[PDB]
Amino acid sequence: DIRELLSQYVDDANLEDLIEWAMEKSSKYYIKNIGNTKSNTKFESKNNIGIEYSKDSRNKLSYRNKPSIATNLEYKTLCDMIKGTSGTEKEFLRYLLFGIKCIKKGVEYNIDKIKDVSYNDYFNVL
Amino acid sequence: KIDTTHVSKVFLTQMNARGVKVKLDFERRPPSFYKPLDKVDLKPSF
Amino acid sequence: PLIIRPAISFWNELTYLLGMIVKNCNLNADEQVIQKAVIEYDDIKIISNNTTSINLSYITSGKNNMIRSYIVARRKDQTARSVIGPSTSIT
Amino acid sequence: VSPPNVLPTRYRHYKISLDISQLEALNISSTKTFITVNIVLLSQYLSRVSLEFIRRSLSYDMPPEVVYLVNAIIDSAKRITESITDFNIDTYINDLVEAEHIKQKSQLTINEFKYEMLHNFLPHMNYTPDQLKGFYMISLLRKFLYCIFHTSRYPDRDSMVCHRILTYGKYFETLAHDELENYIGNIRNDIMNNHKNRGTYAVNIHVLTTPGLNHAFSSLLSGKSDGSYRTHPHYSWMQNISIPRSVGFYPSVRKYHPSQYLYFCSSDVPERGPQVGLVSQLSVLSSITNILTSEYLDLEKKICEYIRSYYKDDISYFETGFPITIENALVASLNPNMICDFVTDFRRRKRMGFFGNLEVGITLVRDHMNEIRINIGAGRLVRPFLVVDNGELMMDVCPELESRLDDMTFSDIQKEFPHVIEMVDIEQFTFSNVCESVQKFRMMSKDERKQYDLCDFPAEFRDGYVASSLVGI
Amino acid sequence: RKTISMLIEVILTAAYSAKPYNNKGENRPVCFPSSNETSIDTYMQFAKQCYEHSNPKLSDEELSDKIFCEKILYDPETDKPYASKVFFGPIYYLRLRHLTQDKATVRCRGKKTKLIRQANEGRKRGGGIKFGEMERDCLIAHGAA
Amino acid sequence: EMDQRLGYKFLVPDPKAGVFYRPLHFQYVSYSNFILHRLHEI
Amino acid sequence: TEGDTIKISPGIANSQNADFDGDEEWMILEQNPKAVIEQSILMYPTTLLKHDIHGAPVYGSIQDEIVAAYSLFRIQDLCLDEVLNILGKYGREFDPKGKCKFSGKDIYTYLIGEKINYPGLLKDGEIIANDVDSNFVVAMRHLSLAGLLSDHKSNVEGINFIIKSSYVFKRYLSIYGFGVTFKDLRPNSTFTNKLEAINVEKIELIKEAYAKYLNDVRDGKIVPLSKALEADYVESMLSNLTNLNIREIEEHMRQTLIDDPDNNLLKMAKAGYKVNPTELMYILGTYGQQRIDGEPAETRVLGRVLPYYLPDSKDPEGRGYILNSLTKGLTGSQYYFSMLVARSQSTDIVCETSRTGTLARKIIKKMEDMVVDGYGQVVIGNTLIKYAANYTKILGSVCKPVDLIYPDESMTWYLEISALWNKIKQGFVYSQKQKLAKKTLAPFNFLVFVKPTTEDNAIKVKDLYDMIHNVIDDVREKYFFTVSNIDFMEYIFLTHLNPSRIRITKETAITIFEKFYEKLNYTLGGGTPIGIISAQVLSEKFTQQALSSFHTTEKSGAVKQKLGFNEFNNLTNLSKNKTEIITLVSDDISKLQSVKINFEFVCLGELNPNITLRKETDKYVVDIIVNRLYIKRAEITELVVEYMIERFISFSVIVKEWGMETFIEDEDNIRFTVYLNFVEPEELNLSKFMMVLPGAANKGKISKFKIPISDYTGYDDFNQTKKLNKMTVELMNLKELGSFDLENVNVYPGVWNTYDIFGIEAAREYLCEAMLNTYGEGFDYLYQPCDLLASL
Amino acid sequence: MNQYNVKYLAKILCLKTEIARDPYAVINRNVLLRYTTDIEYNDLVTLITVRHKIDSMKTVFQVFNESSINYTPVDDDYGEPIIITSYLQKGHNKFPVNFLYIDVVISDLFPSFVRLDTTETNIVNSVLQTGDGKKTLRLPKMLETEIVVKILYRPNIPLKIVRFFRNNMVTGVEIADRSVISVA
RNA sequence: UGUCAUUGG
DNA sequence: AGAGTCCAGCCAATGACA
DNA sequence: GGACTCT
Ligand SMILES: [Mg+2]
């Protein structure tokens, strides 16, 4: 049913490629809430301030503060992506929304085929 | 009659001075008798 | 007995601690001062945090206690100690 | 600590505490002799200047991750300012003085207590205006903010850049000071008890006729001043050089720190026992400075007269400036566009003997700490170096030096060829660019040589006298 | 142990013994510092100049044997040389303060301490050697109960 | 070679500056500063 | 003897860790008759010839006698008088058969005096090895000839070989001499000048390549690397220069020994005493990179170590790489870094000596009451620890680690051998399936009694199988009481006496099995202090490795199990409330990737973002321009970064309202734009948000170690392997792993999670293998002590 | 009980099925080569069908949470409900949630064990006799609340000795015995 | 009879 | 979550000091 | 300085 919205947003020439990439990279990179308590070494201090800020539980709210300042008004798949989608299709819609923004920007939507800067042309002497 | 070191007796008397009573028990072993045993050959059989 | 506190000779601590016990053993005397004398004769670290006081617990205090120093190890007669060297006439 | 012409000396150990949870409790805090104030408000009291000034001063040459903490502590200071209706800084300071005055249950009036509290603040800055005390607190806050983020680019506490060393006479001076104060205090206690027991202004001769100093000078040689004096072991003739040249660091630590490298022997360290990594040995070119009190006062007066006579309109840069301090006492605040014009000229006048001394340490701390430090006291490790002035070796521009060297001594070289050899201390050595060899200097381009301030002597001068007994280590 | 400077010290000591004086005739030492920056070939050239001042003509095998301090040594029993040349030369050698009779201890019988009635401690007092706890572990591990 | 001779000039005694024994001169000056001037000040 | 010194033999010196540089030794005389008999029998050095764990001889030859042994084996074309001069007082019963010219192999054949065989060493008494090296004559080596001679007859024969060998080697040194001169090391300046020019060419090539990379970053043509990867690249270039120096030193050693074949330095290098290409690289080549705590020396004040380098100097020579050698002489900075390593090693061994002593005393007092009882079992108190001591009920000095021969279908009885291998094949694949066992435990050294024989005189094949099977069944009944699995003994006797590779006579097999029954009957006895012997061997080994600095610290990307004494002490401490290294092995990488994404710590600040904010009416707007190569180097996506920032801003207290948008700036940039209004006071909360934003916007468990997915080749058996993916996580509990699809995944936790899930036997097994792994490579003989500790 | 920790329980219930058809079998992961599972997952009851491969015998286990237990016997049932408890409890059909955080039967740390019959128990008890009078050695101990004792359970055969087949780097397999002691 | 200092394997 | 408590290799040798 | 236990 999302092909209606995705043909509203972009052509049907790089469409199911976008769909399969968003599906497998959303089911691959799905992130839960993992740990980070102070009952369990040191990074750079500019990041360590925020890290030991985020270690404690009193700096976090008990329930999620929903966003208020309205963004993404050209692409209003967010209107369902707020709370109609919460399982795998939420991150699937997020990934295809990023792909739609990249392909309307006219640039590569993947990150695997953004190929590495090979640095062993500077460090291959002797 | 006991045959212990002098430092053992000094240690036991000082532990008695701390209040720990140390009481030793002795073996009144039953008198044992040697009886003859059968022949045992541990060499293998080929 | 006196065998745990012999006459020290060079030119006892427990005898002095018992004397400080018996210096408070009177009918017109509190149980707190007798209790403090008994405690610092037996174990000073119950009421204090100082070492080097020769009390009863000195025979069971740490590495230099009585068993580790004088029972499983001792200084012996018929002993010797010397520098070593090699020998070719010695197998 | 007070300057050495102020007897008896005053020690004041201050502490600044910072928490990201409580940025309003940025508390300067001593023990039983000072109040617990916000340091931004204390600098506002001493310097009499706005908080936007302190924000612009702490954010001038800082990386942008430090400016966030600067803005946070300035906003917490403004919040604790606005929390009281019509805030006055003198009223808040005096209220804290009143509160700890009645808290300490001291039997003293409030003018004496307030003068004793606010005049004995910073004994090393005892007779300076209070605005320089406030700007000293601001530069200390700046060093704290930099050390919070870049803690490895700050001098470690086990470093030799941070410490001074006691010689033979300093033990005797410390013990004489302690026993003189004990003698006068015993006389005072005896006089007070004579007035409060019998009622006549008298003193017993049994208290007065003993100074308490004979027994102290006898027990000074027992070494118990942790491990100063000891029984001389008569192992070798070399030990009479080995022991009075060895420096003990008595309690990270005991590992070989880079600050111990040039000024101490690398190989003459103990390898076992309780003092392993604790006792170092001076190099053959390393000395420890001694100075008299008369020379100290003349030297400090001449350096302040040089700072105020020249650069007369350019030493008032308290916002966006380099604080020129002499023995941690903040004296001036130079223009940031003049610092390399200052320090070099200062070195040009140190080797010329313009100040009456040749071992005046002049450290230029760049790298967003931004301070000029002048050290004149005793107990510093100094060493001769070869001067590189503007990209050329000054040893290589004196042609008569090779023909006149054998018929002249070291002081004759320092007087007649003054810009050839500089006496550099370990703090000035740590914060400068030194070249390792003259061969390594001469194999460089003529533009790489402009970066280097000094040049080193050969490596045989980096060993002790015990290590010079060995060959080819 | 990679003590390379000992060989250079023997080479320079032997080169001093060839020529102990300078060109003025005065006793000059050989500057070989604790942290040395002159190469080994400069010391070989100095030793060559010393040995060529001593004997004004040598075969170059003899000169290379004198510089490197190699010598053919002879077995004193059979009066025949060994297989290869031996590093042979003079060096400054040091005696250390650890003598054998300062450490030599023996006790048959002697005093006993008053409390525990075991042997006394010191070496001036003629005490015993402490049969410690690890020696007790060793005699337990031998099976000698 | 010139810096080595300049460094050797520090090690030799300096009779003009009052340095008769450089390996222990700072300790002599330390004790002299105590017993000649600073004890009089204290 | 003469003098005031206690004169010991040098042959016992390595047994006591003794030098003659001022060491003292003590004596005690215990003249009690029971003690006299026990001293005469049990503590005599002939009784203590073999080591009680790994069986190698405790006595042997030292430094000069090694090279004397080598040169005595290599000598040729001697007269009878020269041979008798070398032999000395042992030339009395020397038999010249019909020869007039002799060699050193004839001297060795006379010295051994037995016609025994051994694979790789002996054949009919002659040494069939190429050279005699330090593995042949030095104490505590696995190829000792005295060990083979005492495996053949008795400890008296091994002690006689040691005495006679030391006499003959010292007579060789008296006749021929041995000395190393300076001319053997550095005969001229040619090779050292060549290596100096090579090093000063290659290190300037390294510096110019690194400067080209730095200038390409500085002008902006490439994005910069992380500091860890940059340090790894420079580390690889300097390691390549070090290996080039090593190869040059090895080629010089080869060319010198083919030019001057009588070089004494290369003679003691070939004999196996203390000279290798690395020490000759330290003398003649380069000194290498000086490591402190596994890395170079850390940067102090002004981004440097010494003031001899510029502030924030990228010079690798100023971080501790030494270009000079001991022949050239180290410069001042190089001497600083060498002295830093030396004084660090001295401080570390002084700090570790007392800790090793405390742990040694604790383990000795725990294990000292564990003995072998009258039935061959290992007990302590009234608890049975092991059913059979040393898995054989034979002494550990008699037991021989023999080669494990995997089943081949060319063998005679491949079916029975493969059936036994299917029975015992577990445990031969270990170390998280990374290692396959190459050695097993023969009950005694039966290889010295094996003589080859032509197939007409050999024992019949079925009769040899009947003999092996009947002996192993009788032993399993009568000696192990039908409660111990000794199929490894039958496997050893079936593969090593296999007629497909060796034929033996009937009397050879009778000799072997009679010796087997003799070792089962006479060697091990009740009351053997196996616990204190194992504890002393473990304690002596970790003390030696701590005082010798044998375990070098090295840093890597993943979290690894540590090696050495502090890891051994952490293992025996068994502390509860600490994190454990939990290893996840899987055939498919998707199941490891799903846990690696969720557990690996990535923050916004380590992604190197470009964060800039500006105030606007109704909103403070923060633009976060991140680079996409930084997102790919973190192995995450842009949606992961968006989720990190969104989770932090949506759950924070100081933010009152917010709204997020994602812009595309390039294929090199992604702009996360946040619109914000903070909780009043909004300026202080603004500054606190801008301070904590690069760190608090994160994901995963906070740890200093990353989680890289490794891979290796794991064993299912000897003949079948598979590629396996590995992953290690520092983790306290096992609870948060319970939300993932961890099916068909091997999980190796620490000791307390293994106890709480799998039980006490798996905890015992983990403790065994983990305590063994702390000693390093080459210490498999410490398996039997460590098990004895773990079972305690 | 979730959709992931029921497959690990299915691997455990293959070993429980093997013990239910032969109490003196050797339990390791190789037993999993002789069985086949089918899982019907639901948040009230999960049905796990274990099938023997060659004999085609089926056994249906009904897996419940500790709170909601609705057990009526289905055909081919095990005879007792399998309960996933929150903590380690006493009972052969009560598996705690920590046992099923990972896949435990396929692990290298999963042991190989047997229950001894009366002949092997008599041999072990006569080996443990010290010969002197009525004195006896003791086996090392193991708690009854362990997954080995839960797998090895038989209703009228009391489990006192468990024989373990340890991995051994030098000998292959080693035999040990633990004695099962009581809890609560 | 114990502390402190220095040193050795 | 934070203080109390106990633990820190073995065997030496000199001298000074209470 | 660091690990175990009671609070
Ligand atoms: Mg030695």
PDB file of C-alpha atoms in Angstrom, chain G residues 373 375 377 379 382-384 386-387 391 423-424 426-428 430 432-433 437 439-441 481 483-485 488 734-735 737-749 754-762 764-765 772 780 783-784 787 791, chain H residues 2 4-5 7-8 11 28-29 88 98-112 123-124 127-132 136-143 146-148 163-178:
ATOM      1  CA  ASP G 373      46.134 -42.219  48.248  1.00  0.00           C
ATOM      2  CA  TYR G 375      44.620 -46.748  45.436  1.00  0.00           C
ATOM      3  CA  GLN G 377      43.396 -41.716  43.356  1.00  0.00           C
ATOM      4  CA  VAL G 379      42.189 -37.045  47.329  1.00  0.00           C
ATOM      5  CA  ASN G 382      37.957 -37.418  52.516  1.00  0.00           C
ATOM      6  CA  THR G 383      36.996 -36.040  49.094  1.00  0.00           C
ATOM      7  CA  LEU G 384      38.005 -37.784  45.876  1.00  0.00           C
ATOM      8  CA  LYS G 386      40.637 -37.546  40.724  1.00  0.00           C
ATOM      9  CA  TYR G 387      40.002 -41.218  40.077  1.00  0.00           C
ATOM     10  CA  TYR G 391      45.375 -39.832  34.292  1.00  0.00           C
ATOM     11  CA  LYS G 423      35.140 -42.213  21.611  1.00  0.00           C
ATOM     12  CA  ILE G 424      37.861 -39.785  22.730  1.00  0.00           C
ATOM     13  CA  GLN G 426      36.209 -34.489  22.296  1.00  0.00           C
ATOM     14  CA  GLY G 427      38.781 -32.510  24.224  1.00  0.00           C
ATOM     15  CA  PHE G 428      41.232 -32.775  21.329  1.00  0.00           C
ATOM     16  CA  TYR G 430      39.693 -26.980  22.359  1.00  0.00           C
ATOM     17  CA  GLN G 432      36.873 -22.244  21.441  1.00  0.00           C
ATOM     18  CA  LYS G 433      37.501 -24.677  18.540  1.00  0.00           C
ATOM     19  CA  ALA G 437      45.647 -31.269  19.890  1.00  0.00           C
ATOM     20  CA  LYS G 439      50.235 -34.377  21.512  1.00  0.00           C
ATOM     21  CA  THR G 440      48.745 -36.935  23.871  1.00  0.00           C
ATOM     22  CA  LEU G 441      50.072 -38.680  26.987  1.00  0.00           C
ATOM     23  CA  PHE G 481      38.895 -50.664  38.823  1.00  0.00           C
ATOM     24  CA  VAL G 483      35.910 -46.536  36.552  1.00  0.00           C
ATOM     25  CA  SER G 484      38.494 -44.753  34.377  1.00  0.00           C
ATOM     26  CA  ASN G 485      38.604 -44.267  30.610  1.00  0.00           C
ATOM     27  CA  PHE G 488      43.936 -42.997  24.965  1.00  0.00           C
ATOM     28  CA  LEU G 734      23.604 -12.379  30.625  1.00  0.00           C
ATOM     29  CA  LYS G 735      20.118 -10.853  30.809  1.00  0.00           C
ATOM     30  CA  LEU G 737      21.368 -10.903  25.534  1.00  0.00           C
ATOM     31  CA  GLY G 738      17.986 -12.589  26.062  1.00  0.00           C
ATOM     32  CA  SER G 739      16.155 -10.305  23.622  1.00  0.00           C
ATOM     33  CA  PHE G 740      18.096 -11.459  20.544  1.00  0.00           C
ATOM     34  CA  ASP G 741      17.898 -14.370  18.102  1.00  0.00           C
ATOM     35  CA  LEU G 742      20.950 -16.152  19.487  1.00  0.00           C
ATOM     36  CA  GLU G 743      20.154 -19.584  18.070  1.00  0.00           C
ATOM     37  CA  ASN G 744      23.008 -21.773  16.742  1.00  0.00           C
ATOM     38  CA  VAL G 745      25.445 -19.409  18.501  1.00  0.00           C
ATOM     39  CA  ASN G 746      28.185 -20.638  20.823  1.00  0.00           C
ATOM     40  CA  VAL G 747      28.380 -18.435  23.920  1.00  0.00           C
ATOM     41  CA  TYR G 748      31.424 -18.587  26.210  1.00  0.00           C
ATOM     42  CA  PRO G 749      30.817 -16.483  29.338  1.00  0.00           C
ATOM     43  CA  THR G 754      29.097 -20.506  33.421  1.00  0.00           C
ATOM     44  CA  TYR G 755      28.412 -21.688  36.967  1.00  0.00           C
ATOM     45  CA  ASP G 756      24.963 -20.098  37.123  1.00  0.00           C
ATOM     46  CA  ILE G 757      23.893 -21.541  33.771  1.00  0.00           C
ATOM     47  CA  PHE G 758      25.809 -24.715  32.976  1.00  0.00           C
ATOM     48  CA  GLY G 759      26.930 -25.740  36.455  1.00  0.00           C
ATOM     49  CA  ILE G 760      29.934 -26.653  38.563  1.00  0.00           C
ATOM     50  CA  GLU G 761      31.640 -28.993  36.075  1.00  0.00           C
ATOM     51  CA  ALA G 762      31.610 -26.403  33.307  1.00  0.00           C
ATOM     52  CA  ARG G 764      35.767 -26.341  36.636  1.00  0.00           C
ATOM     53  CA  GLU G 765      36.492 -26.751  32.911  1.00  0.00           C
ATOM     54  CA  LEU G 772      46.249 -22.576  31.413  1.00  0.00           C
ATOM     55  CA  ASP G 780      50.842 -27.503  27.686  1.00  0.00           C
ATOM     56  CA  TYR G 783      47.532 -28.565  31.956  1.00  0.00           C
ATOM     57  CA  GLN G 784      47.717 -31.330  34.578  1.00  0.00           C
ATOM     58  CA  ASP G 787      43.266 -29.005  36.318  1.00  0.00           C
ATOM     59  CA  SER G 791      39.242 -29.316  40.600  1.00  0.00           C
TER      60      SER G 791
ATOM     61  CA  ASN H   2       9.297 -15.144  24.371  1.00  0.00           C
ATOM     62  CA  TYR H   4      13.482 -16.732  21.161  1.00  0.00           C
ATOM     63  CA  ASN H   5      13.852 -18.573  24.479  1.00  0.00           C
ATOM     64  CA  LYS H   7      13.867 -22.823  20.811  1.00  0.00           C
ATOM     65  CA  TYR H   8      16.522 -23.283  23.489  1.00  0.00           C
ATOM     66  CA  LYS H  11      16.658 -28.284  22.512  1.00  0.00           C
ATOM     67  CA  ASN H  28      25.206 -34.292  25.069  1.00  0.00           C
ATOM     68  CA  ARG H  29      24.501 -32.213  21.976  1.00  0.00           C
ATOM     69  CA  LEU H  88      15.742 -20.901  39.952  1.00  0.00           C
ATOM     70  CA  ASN H  98      18.363 -17.269  33.140  1.00  0.00           C
ATOM     71  CA  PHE H  99      18.818 -20.784  31.698  1.00  0.00           C
ATOM     72  CA  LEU H 100      17.266 -19.610  28.412  1.00  0.00           C
ATOM     73  CA  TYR H 101      19.140 -16.350  27.823  1.00  0.00           C
ATOM     74  CA  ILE H 102      21.493 -18.146  25.409  1.00  0.00           C
ATOM     75  CA  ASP H 103      21.476 -21.424  23.488  1.00  0.00           C
ATOM     76  CA  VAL H 104      22.810 -23.779  26.131  1.00  0.00           C
ATOM     77  CA  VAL H 105      22.722 -27.297  24.693  1.00  0.00           C
ATOM     78  CA  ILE H 106      24.766 -26.447  21.588  1.00  0.00           C
ATOM     79  CA  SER H 107      27.418 -24.699  23.680  1.00  0.00           C
ATOM     80  CA  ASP H 108      30.895 -26.079  24.237  1.00  0.00           C
ATOM     81  CA  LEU H 109      30.330 -25.627  27.975  1.00  0.00           C
ATOM     82  CA  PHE H 110      27.371 -28.004  27.965  1.00  0.00           C
ATOM     83  CA  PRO H 111      28.552 -31.161  29.764  1.00  0.00           C
ATOM     84  CA  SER H 112      28.258 -34.831  28.838  1.00  0.00           C
ATOM     85  CA  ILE H 123      31.301 -50.229  41.599  1.00  0.00           C
ATOM     86  CA  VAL H 124      31.706 -46.520  42.443  1.00  0.00           C
ATOM     87  CA  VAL H 127      35.922 -47.973  44.807  1.00  0.00           C
ATOM     88  CA  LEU H 128      35.284 -45.098  47.233  1.00  0.00           C
ATOM     89  CA  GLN H 129      35.692 -47.437  50.223  1.00  0.00           C
ATOM     90  CA  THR H 130      39.090 -46.724  51.773  1.00  0.00           C
ATOM     91  CA  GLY H 131      39.637 -50.347  52.858  1.00  0.00           C
ATOM     92  CA  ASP H 132      40.043 -49.398  56.536  1.00  0.00           C
ATOM     93  CA  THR H 136      34.470 -43.962  52.797  1.00  0.00           C
ATOM     94  CA  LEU H 137      35.652 -41.191  50.501  1.00  0.00           C
ATOM     95  CA  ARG H 138      33.222 -38.568  49.231  1.00  0.00           C
ATOM     96  CA  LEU H 139      32.514 -37.506  45.691  1.00  0.00           C
ATOM     97  CA  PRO H 140      32.502 -33.784  44.893  1.00  0.00           C
ATOM     98  CA  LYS H 141      29.131 -32.140  45.251  1.00  0.00           C
ATOM     99  CA  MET H 142      26.532 -30.683  42.897  1.00  0.00           C
ATOM    100  CA  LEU H 143      23.270 -28.935  43.734  1.00  0.00           C
ATOM    101  CA  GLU H 146      20.931 -27.618  38.223  1.00  0.00           C
ATOM    102  CA  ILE H 147      20.012 -28.153  34.583  1.00  0.00           C
ATOM    103  CA  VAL H 148      21.755 -31.556  34.536  1.00  0.00           C
ATOM    104  CA  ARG H 163      28.922 -39.261  35.929  1.00  0.00           C
ATOM    105  CA  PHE H 164      30.498 -36.547  33.791  1.00  0.00           C
ATOM    106  CA  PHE H 165      32.595 -37.090  30.662  1.00  0.00           C
ATOM    107  CA  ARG H 166      34.988 -34.153  30.840  1.00  0.00           C
ATOM    108  CA  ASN H 167      36.906 -32.811  27.889  1.00  0.00           C
ATOM    109  CA  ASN H 168      40.612 -33.432  28.412  1.00  0.00           C
ATOM    110  CA  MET H 169      43.308 -31.862  26.255  1.00  0.00           C
ATOM    111  CA  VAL H 170      45.783 -34.711  26.757  1.00  0.00           C
ATOM    112  CA  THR H 171      43.598 -37.833  27.174  1.00  0.00           C
ATOM    113  CA  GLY H 172      40.428 -37.034  25.259  1.00  0.00           C
ATOM    114  CA  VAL H 173      37.643 -37.881  27.698  1.00  0.00           C
ATOM    115  CA  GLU H 174      37.974 -38.089  31.490  1.00  0.00           C
ATOM    116  CA  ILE H 175      35.498 -39.703  33.898  1.00  0.00           C
ATOM    117  CA  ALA H 176      34.353 -37.803  36.975  1.00  0.00           C
ATOM    118  CA  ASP H 177      31.433 -38.224  39.365  1.00  0.00           C
ATOM    119  CA  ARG H 178      29.393 -35.697  41.313  1.00  0.00           C
TER     120      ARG H 178
END
